[PDB]
Amino acid sequence: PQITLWKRPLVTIKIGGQLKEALLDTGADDTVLEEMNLPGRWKPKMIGGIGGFIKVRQYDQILIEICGHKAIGTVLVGPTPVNIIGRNLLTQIGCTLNF
Amino acid sequence: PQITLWKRPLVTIKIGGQLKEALLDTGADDTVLEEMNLPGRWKPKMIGGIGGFIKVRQYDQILIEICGHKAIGTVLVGPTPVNIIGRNLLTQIGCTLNF
Ligand SMILES: CC(C)CN(C[C@@H](O)[C@H](Cc1ccccc1)NC(=O)O[C@H]1CO[C@H]2OCC[C@H]21)S(=O)(=O)c1ccc([C@H](O)CO)cc1
Numbered sequence: 001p002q003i004t005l006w007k008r009p010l011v012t013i014k015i016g017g018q019l020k021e022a023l024l025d026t027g028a029d030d031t032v033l034e035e036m037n038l039p040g041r042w043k044p045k046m047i048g049g050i051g052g053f054i055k056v057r058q059y060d061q062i063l064i065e066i067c068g069h070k071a072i073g074t075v076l077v078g079p080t081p082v083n084i085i086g087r088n089l090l091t092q093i094g095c096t097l098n099f
Numbered sequence: 100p101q102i103t104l105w106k107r108p109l110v111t112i113k114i115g116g117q118l119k120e121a122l123l124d125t126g127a128d129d130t131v132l133e134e135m136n137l138p139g140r141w142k143p144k145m146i147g148g149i150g151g152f153i154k155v156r157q158y159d160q161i162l163i164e165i166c167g168h169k170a171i172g173t174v175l176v177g178p179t180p181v182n183i184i185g186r187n188l189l190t191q192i193g194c195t196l197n198f
Pocket residue numbers: 025027028029030031032047048049050076081082084086122124125126127128129130131146147148149150181183185
């Protein structure tokens with residue numbers, strides 16, 4: 001589809017057997033998701049933006065479906081205020097910016 | 100242009116007569132630029148990101164050219180980690196997400 005940017009580009013995702021709403025975010029290298037108790041091993045990470053840094057847990061090779069488009073990659077889990085789909089997954093669903 | 104997302108969507112912008120590099124950021128409501136001198140009046144404002152809230156200077160109705168496309172809108176100036184072009188200007192240059 002084509003998503004205009006009058007409003008936040010929120011879409012439904014499926015991850016860890018749960019459906020959630022997330023931003024398609026060209027300004028994020030990586031994908032950051034709200035706190036959720038995913039199984040498996042993880043690595044600590046700190047990530048920074050406006051306001052400073054938050055601590056997250058890095059999970060690798062996580063399956064995630066974005067608007068019916070399947071992807072698999074790294075997801076960072078932590079106290080983010082919003083679910084953020086970053087470029088590591090946006091490339092996998094064929095997403096581009098156009099103007 | 101059509102911009103793929105294997106790399107950061109960085110573009111050259113012109114504001115206050117000066118060229119800078121900025122990130123096209125669909126996850127940003129607003130445009131936030133690093134500390135700089137800009138002519139005109141401004142108002143103190145607050146903006147929140149992944150890590151909390153920061154104080155910024157709000158410049159309204161500012162001329163800014165983004166990758167060869169003119170926009171006139173609000174620009175926030177403050178301690179952002181990266182110059183980001185948000186939806187308030189992305190809409191003005193006709194930017195959409197497509198997949
Ligand atoms: C360069 C950007 C600042 C990076 N960021 C993505 C932005 O899109 C961000 C996404 C967002 C965060 C919190 C609330 C709402 C949106 N937007 C945002 O700050 O926008 C400002 C401005 O306009 C206002 O609207 C929204 C909130 C206001 S990030 O999140 O800090 C981030 C940092 C490091 C990673 C590493 O890649 C991980 O490894 C991934 C993602």
